[model samples]
Target chain A: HHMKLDLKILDARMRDYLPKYATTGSAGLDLRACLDAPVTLKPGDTALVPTGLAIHLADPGYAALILPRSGLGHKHGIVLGNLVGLIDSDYQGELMISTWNRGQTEFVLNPFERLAQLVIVPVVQATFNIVGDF
Target chain B: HHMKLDLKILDARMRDYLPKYATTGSAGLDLRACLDAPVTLKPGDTALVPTGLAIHLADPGYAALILPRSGLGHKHGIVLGNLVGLIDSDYQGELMISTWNRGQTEFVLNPFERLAQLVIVPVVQATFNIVGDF
Candidate 1:
C-alpha cells in the first residue's frame, strides 16, 4: 500500500508510540494514548484525548477515520465521544480523538497504550445527478 | 451517486426503512432500527440490533463499515458494541449493528428510528515492505 502519510509528533513521549501496522493482515494503524500519566475517566465523563501527533492525507481522494479499539470498546465500553472522527484530506492539524467513558467503573489510560485506530479510506466528492421525473 | 447495492430485506417492516442517504452531502446511509417494538437499553447494556438488510459488496477493493450516529452517541451515549463493525467484501450476511448504550440514563429505540450508519470504503489488501535498519 503506497498510502504514504506524514505524521507530526507533538509530544516527545509519543516518539515511541509511532503509528505502525501491527501485522501484514492489519488494515489500519493503531494509535496510542499520549497522555501525561494515566488519566482516570469516570463514567459519563468525556475528554479530548490527544494522540500527540498530526497527520496529513494529502491525496484528495482519501480521508482518515478514527475508531475505537476493539478490546477497549467491547470489554470496557470506552469509545469515541464524537462516535467516529472523520478527517478530511485537507486537514493538517494535530489528530485528536474524543475519548469517552461509557462504563460503570473508571478506566485509566496510560501513556502510549494503544487507545484507538486510524484508517485511511477512499472518498468520493460527488455531484448531484438530477433528472426530470421519469 | 448511483452505486447499485443489492439489499436483502430480512423483514417486511424494514421495507419501509429502506437504506438511503439523508442529504446529498451525507457520506453514508442511515440504518433504521428494525425491531418488533421499542427496545429499552439501560446504561451499560448492549444488544445486537438488526438493520433488517444484507448487502453484498462483491468487490475485493471495497468493504462496508457500520458506524454510530453523532446525535445518538453524543447525546444518548449509544454506540456500537464492537466499537466499529467492519464488513468484509465477500460478506453476504444480514447487516447487524452491535448496539451498545454507554450513557447514564435509559434509552428506548423506536421501531424505525435511525440508529446506525453504513459507509462503503475502499480497502487495500496490503503487501509487506522490508527495509534494512539503518
Candidate 2:
C-alpha cells in the first residue's frame, strides 16, 4: 500500500539529490547535506545541516524519524546531536539534520553528501487513561 | 485504532515500572533502566543496560524505535551508542539500551531510572522496481 506524499524542493540543487528507497527491502531514504562548501566538524562538535527539502505528512497518524547511517555511526562516530529526530505530521518547514562528530577525529562533510536517513512511520497520538495502579 | 501487544516481564522490578504513555497527546512510552546498583558512565563510555522487558509486535508491518530522552541527550549528553535502535516485529528478546555518555562529565544511572523512550510505529516493507530513470 502506498500513500501520497507532498514534497517541496526548497533548493534547486536538491532536485537532483532527492531522497529515494535504496533497495527493495530498504526501510529508509538517504538524506543529503545541502551545503555550499565542505564543513569541518571536530571532536565533540555539532552542526545543523539543511536538507533543502520539505514534506507534508498531513495525516496525524504518521510521522518521520531521522537516524544516522549505521556505518558512519558505529565506525566514525558521526551521529545526530538530537540522537533521533521526530518530525511531526503537521510540520512544513525545511528538513534539518543535527550533525554531531562523536568520534575522536575531525570529520569533513561535503555538499550533497548522504549524512542521514529518514524513515516514514505510522504514529499514534494517545489520550492517556491515568490510574493509580494498573 | 489500538493494536494488542504481547509484553513479558523479564525482571520483577519492571512490574512496577511498566511502560506507559505519559500524557494524552504523548507519542512515546518511557522505558526505565533495570539495574541492581548505580552505574557510572564516564565521558565517551558506552554500556548495554537492560530494560527487563520484552515485547512481540507479531505483525511485520510494525516496529518500535528506542530513542534517548530529549533532556538527557541535549543537556546531559547521555544518548544511545547506536544513535537509534530499530526493533523488528519478530524480535522477542529482552530490551537492551546501549547507553553512552557523550559529555565532558560523568553520569550516574540509578536503578529504575527513566533512560529512554519507545515509540510503536507502522513500518513498510518496500519492493523497489528498478528502472533506468524516474
Candidate 3:
C-alpha cells in the first residue's frame, strides 16, 4: 500500500506546498497552480495552467491521474478541459493542467493555490486474448 | 497489475460485449452504453447514461475510475459532466455515466456503443501523519 515516487520541484515556492495526503484514507494529493498571477477563467474558457512540478513514475505497470478537487468542481464548476488526464510512466515533463470553466460564472485561479489533485494507481498493460466467449 | 473484479451483467446483451483490454499495454476497459434506443445529445446537453453493468471491488485498498474516451472527447467533445468519476470500493449500484455534449454539433449515442473506459487501480487510504514539516 506504500510506494516511493520521484517529484521535481520546478518552482521554489512549491517546496512549501509539497503534495501530500490530507488524511490517512485519502486517495489523492492536492496539486497547486504555479502561476505568476491570478488567471480568470470565463465560462467555457480553457487554459493550460502549469503545476510547477514534474514527476517520473518510470514504471509501465502504473500511471498517474489528475482529477479536479471535489469542492472546486462541484461549487465553482472548475474542471479539466481534457475531462481526465493520464500521465504515462515515462512522462518527464512539467505537469500541465487544462483548466476549464464549465459553469455560468467566471472563476479566478490564484497563484500557488490548489487546483487539482493527483492520484497514483496501479495499471495493467494487458494483451487481448480474444475468444468466441469468455 | 492484475486483479479479479466481480461483474454483474444487468443487461443480457452485455454478455456478448464484455469489457476487455484492446492492446497489450492498454490501461482501460471499454464501457458501452446499454441503451435500447439511440439518444441524441444536443450541444451543451447532459444525460445520465447507463452502462447496464455493476462492478464490486470489495477491497478498500482500490477503486475504479471512469474516464472519457480520448477520441470521443477530442473529436466529438463528449465528456462526463462530473469531469471524472471515482467509484468507491463499497458501491454496488448500476454504473451510470453523466454524459455531456460540450461541442457545437449534436452527437448520437447508439445503443451498446462504447462511450467511456474503465480503469481499475490501487488506491491508498492513508493516515496523515502530520508533523511540523516533512
Candidate 4:
C-alpha cells in the first residue's frame, strides 16, 4: 500500500515545474526557485527562496527532509542555509529554502531554477528508555 | 517489524558512539569524526572526514542519506561537501563526510566530534510511462 501526499499550490510560477518525481528511481523531488526576478548570491551569501507550494503529510509517521541538488552544490557551491531542512508533519506554511552560495564567485539564480530537493521518509518516534547504567 | 542495519567498525574511536537511535523516538544515528587530531575549517573549507564505520545495507530497495545536524549547519555553518550524500545499498567503503564550513569564523572539529547524522529510507524505482502528458 502507498501513501497519498496532498500538495497545495500557492504561486503560479510553480505551475510549469510543480515538483514532480522525475524518475521512479529518484528518491526525491526537485524544488524550483519561485522568484519574480533573478537573484544574485555573492560569495558567502544566503537567502530564503520560495517553492510556491505547500504540502500536508497529514500523517505523523512520516516527515519531509529538504536537501540540496547534488550537481549544484558540488560544482557551484550552492547549498541550503540549513544543510538540511526538516519539515514537521503538522507544518502548514509554504515550503521555504534557505539558499546559500558557498562558492568563491557570485552565483546568479533565475526564476523557476531548480534549487533543492525534498524526500519524504518514514520517521520513527520511539518511547524513551531510562537507564542509570549501560 | 523492525529491521537491524549491520555496521562494521573500521576505527576504534567510534566504539563509544557506534551510532544508536539515541531514544528509539529518533529516526537518525549520530556519526562521529574519526580524526587523529583536531581539524580547523575556515570559511568555504570542505574537507573529507571519516566516520570509522561501514555498513552493509544489502537491500536495493533502501538507501542511506547523510544529512547535517540541524544545529551545526544552521548555527555554525558546518555541513557536507555534497550537500546531501547518497549512500547506495551496495556501498562497502568506509563512511565518509565531506565536511564543509560555510560560515565566517573558523570552527575546530575535534577528534571524535559528532559531525553528521545518517538516516535510512525506502526508495522507489519506477518505470517510465514515456507519455506526452505527465
TM-score of each: 0.64, 0.64, 0.64, 0.63
Candidate 1 Cα lDDT to native:
0.77
Candidate 2 steric clashes = 0
lDDT of 1 by residue, B12-114 (tens): 8887779887798888989888888899999879877778888877766666788889999999988787678766666788877778886788999888889
List per-prediction Cα lDDT, in the order shown. 0.77, 0.84, 0.82, 0.80
Question: Model 1 chain A — which ten-residue stretch has the worst lDDT?
Answer: A20-29
- The pairs that clash in candidate 1 are none
DockQ of every candidate: 0.19, 0.19, 0.19, 0.16
True contacts kept of 2: 0.24
Please report how far candidate 4 places residue B21 from its true position, in Å: 14
Stretches off by above 4 angstroms in model 1 are A127-134, B1-43, B47-60, B68-79, B87-97, B102-120, B124-134
TM-score (second chain) of model 3: 0.93
lDDT of 4 at A103: 80
Each candidate: fraction of true contacts kept? 0.23, 0.24, 0.24, 0.18
Selected candidate, larger DockQ, 2 vs 4: 2
Give the candidate number with the greatest DockQ.
3
Candidate 4 C-alpha lDDT tens digits along B1-134: 25677889899767876887788689888898999899999988888888999997776567789889999999999988778887656777898888988788899998888889898877533222222211
